[PDB]
Design an enzyme around this catalytic site. Structure first.
Site, short mmCIF file in Angstrom:
data_model
loop_
_atom_site.label_atom_id
_atom_site.label_comp_id
_atom_site.label_asym_id
_atom_site.label_seq_id
_atom_site.Cartn_x
_atom_site.Cartn_y
_atom_site.Cartn_z
N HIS A 122 -63.02 83.46 -27.65
CA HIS A 122 -64.05 84.34 -27.11
C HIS A 122 -65.46 83.82 -27.36
CE1 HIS A 122 -64.35 86.45 -31.07
NE2 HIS A 122 -63.04 86.54 -31.04
N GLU B 218 -55.97 81.86 -27.90
CA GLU B 218 -57.26 82.37 -28.37
C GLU B 218 -57.95 81.37 -29.30
OE1 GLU B 218 -58.42 84.77 -26.75
OE2 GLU B 218 -60.29 85.19 -27.79
N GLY C 278 -65.07 92.78 -36.24
CA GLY C 278 -64.51 91.50 -36.61
C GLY C 278 -64.41 90.52 -35.46
N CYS D 94 -66.29 87.65 -34.95
CA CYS D 94 -67.06 86.45 -35.26
C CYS D 94 -66.17 85.30 -35.73
CB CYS D 94 -68.12 86.68 -36.35
SG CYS D 94 -69.25 88.03 -36.07
C1 LIG Z 1 -68.44 89.30 -36.99
C2 LIG Z 1 -68.53 89.19 -38.52
C3 LIG Z 1 -67.58 90.18 -39.15
O1 LIG Z 1 -66.44 89.91 -39.33
N1 LIG Z 1 -68.07 91.48 -39.47
C4 LIG Z 1 -69.47 91.86 -39.23
C5 LIG Z 1 -67.13 92.46 -40.03
C6 LIG Z 1 -67.19 92.41 -41.54
N2 LIG Z 1 -67.83 93.27 -42.30
C7 LIG Z 1 -67.80 92.99 -43.62
C8 LIG Z 1 -68.45 93.92 -44.66
F1 LIG Z 1 -69.78 93.66 -44.63
F2 LIG Z 1 -68.19 95.24 -44.35
F3 LIG Z 1 -67.93 93.70 -45.91
C9 LIG Z 1 -67.02 91.85 -43.97
S1 LIG Z 1 -66.47 91.24 -42.49
#
Ligand SMILES: C=CC(=O)N(C)Cc1nc(C(F)(F)F)cs1
Length: 181
Positions: free
Chosen positions: A40, A71, A145, A147
């Site tokens: 993606h 993916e 999630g 990224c």
């Molecule tokens: C795309 C990055 C990602 O994966 N994001 C923002 C989700 C996550 N958020 C956390 C936190 F900050 F809640 F601990 C760890 S991973």
């Protein structure tokens, strides 16, 4: 402990922050100038890597023998630097794990280690409308999630995080042959 020792060394030498027109992603450099991203990310002819503009020489979106999406996108980077070769840490067959850590590294979420615990076989998954194969599943309670991220256990690199349902997360499983030759 030993699991985090390996994850930290992987971050240092092989996990980089990148940005495409689709956003901020964790990139795994595999060896030489070869790296892998979640599909993606849709890398273009150039990509931002650790604040530097890098040409993408080739991009391949991986599919299985039926042409089902995996993916994963393999890119070759226009650079002189070489990633440490971590392919010996990628198993020959897609592998589950206990006590796994998800390594996220983007500009907005730098150097972030998330304990996910057990990583279990899942297989075929409809990922936001796109049928996908060879996935695994773990606890990951976020709706953001999107990224990427590198799933690791003690001495093993087992998956690239591709998405989730707000309770569980899912990774594309990694096998050594995807990176061969
Ligand atoms: C795309 C990055 C990602 O994966 N994001 C923002 C989700 C996550 N958020 C956390 C936190 F900050 F809640 F601990 C760890 S991973």
């Amino acid at each position: 402990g030993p699991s985090l020792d390996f994850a930290l060394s992987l971050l240092r030498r092989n996990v980089r922050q990148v940005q495409t027109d689709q956003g901020h992603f964790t990139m795994l450099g595999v060896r030489d100038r070869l790296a892998v991203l979640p599909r993606h990310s849709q890398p273009g002819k150039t990509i931002w890597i650790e604040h530097k503009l890098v040409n993408v020489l080739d991009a391949v979106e991986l599919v299985d023998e039926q042409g089902v999406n995996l993916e994963l996108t393999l890119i070759t980077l226009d650079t002189n630097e070489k990633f440490r070769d971590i392919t010996k840490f990628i198993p020959e067959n897609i592998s589950t794990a206990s006590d796994a850590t998800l390594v996220i590294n983007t500009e907005h979420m730098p150097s972030m280690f998330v304990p996910v615990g057990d990583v279990v076989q899942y297989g075929f998954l409809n990922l936001s409308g796109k049928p996908t194969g060879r996935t695994m599943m773990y606890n990951f309670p976020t709706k953001a999630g999107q990224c990427g991220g590198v799933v690791t256990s003690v001495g093993k690199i087992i998956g690239i995080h591709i998405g989730g349902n707000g309770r569980q997360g899912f990774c594309a499983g990694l096998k050594r042959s995807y990176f061969a030759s």
